[PDB]
């Protein structure tokens, strides 16, 4: 029984949660993320894997700092403060 009997011992983790994409693709024995490649200094991606590339690019996320850079640019990286008028 290659089949359901043997499925019944599928009880150990191949991967666990990637500490860098919290994705349960962190191969225990092999110690690297099948998705993003941590600990490698670079990030796994590949031009053939284009939709998956779309799943993760700048923009699928908070964009905590890049959000406002356009604004800041818009205004000439104003360093300073606004004064007043009235009304």
């Amino acid at each position: 029984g290659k089949g359901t009997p043997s499925f019944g011992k599928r009880h150990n983790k191949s991967h666990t949660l990637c500490n860098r994409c919290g994705r349960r693709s962190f191969h225990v024995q092999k110690k690297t993320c099948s998705s993003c490649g941590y600990p490698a200094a670079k990030t796994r991606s590949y031009n053939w894997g284009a939709k998956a590339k779309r799943r993760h690019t700048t923009g699928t996320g908070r964009m905590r700092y890049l959000k406002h850079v356009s604004r800041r640019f818009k205004n000439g990286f104003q360093t300073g403060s606004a004064s007043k008028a009235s009304a």
């Binding site: 983790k13 666990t16 949660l17 349960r24």
Partner: protein, 50 residues
């Protein structure tokens, strides 16, 4: 698994929080579009992957 690591508890602990029905007042906002909580999760129906 009866002796967890804190990374699994904390993920469980959040996942329990998500397991409540729509607060019925939200059905009442102007333009309220949500009818039922469409993401509810059940322990013996979908496993959550550690």
């Amino acid at each position: 698994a009866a002796q967890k690591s804190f990374r699994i508890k904390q993920k469980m602990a959040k996942a329990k929080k998500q397991n409540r029905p729509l607060p019925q007042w939200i059905r009442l906002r102007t333009n309220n579009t949500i009818r039922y909580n469409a993401k509810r999760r059940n322990w013996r129906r979908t496993k959550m992957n550690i």
